[PDB]
């Protein structure tokens, strides 16, 4: 049996840690909901 536990409010937070890149990727989405790279 799966159960839920509150972890926080949903808020924007000024001066969070800023990270990650912004890749443009060709992708396909199959009937099982899996993404795959189209190269």
């Amino acid at each position: 049996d799966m159960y839920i536990e509150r972890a926080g409010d949903i808020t924007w937070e000024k001066d969070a840690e800023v990270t990650g890149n912004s890749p443009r990727l060709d992708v396909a989405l199959d009937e099982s909901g899996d993404f795959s790279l189209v190269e």
Partner: protein
């Protein structure tokens, strides 16, 4: 059960100890998560039961107690925040400029942040604190890193 708006962990005891299998959003009395987290099973909140209401394996989404409520969209321009809720770790904002998944049916925002799989369902927010989608359905890239769609449902 607890039905205050916010972000929630999804836990199981069917494995060793208490294991976090994913995360979701409580908004307007509806619980929102990714299909691959719950596989559409019922959930417990304290002594209360949450039953599945809507779901779609291809969208990889599921709602509990009522229809999908989250309808905000990535602007296509601005940085966003993953409110990451990792297993055993405090909820933490991470600000990022989404990339793009280009598909035959249209472009989707994507976020290139690597977290454990049990982070699946953590919300992605815009500057007004609205949920523009859920992290944890995406692809493994040349590098070996993880890039997640911004996955959003439709509000009927």
């Amino acid at each position: 059960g607890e039905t205050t708006d916010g972000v929630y962990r999804v836990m199981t005891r069917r494995l060793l100890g208490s294991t976090q299998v994913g995360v979701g959003v409580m908004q307007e009395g509806v619980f929102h998560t990714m299909w691959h987290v719950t596989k559409g099973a019922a959930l417990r909140s304290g002594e209360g039961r949450l039953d599945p209401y809507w779901g779609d394996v291809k969208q990889d989404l599921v709602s509990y107690c009522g229809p999908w409520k989250l309808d905000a969209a990535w602007d296509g321009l601005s940085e966003v925040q993953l409110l990451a809720v990792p297993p055993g770790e405090r909820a933490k904002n991470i600000q990022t400029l989404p990339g793009i998944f280009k598909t035959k049916d249209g472009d989707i925002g994507a976020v290139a942040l690597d977290y454990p799989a049990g982070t699946s369902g953590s919300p992605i927010l815009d500057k007004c604190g609205r949920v523009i989608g859920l992290y944890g359905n995406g692809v493994v890239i040349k590098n070996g890193s993880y890039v997640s769609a911004i996955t959003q449902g439709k509000r009927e």
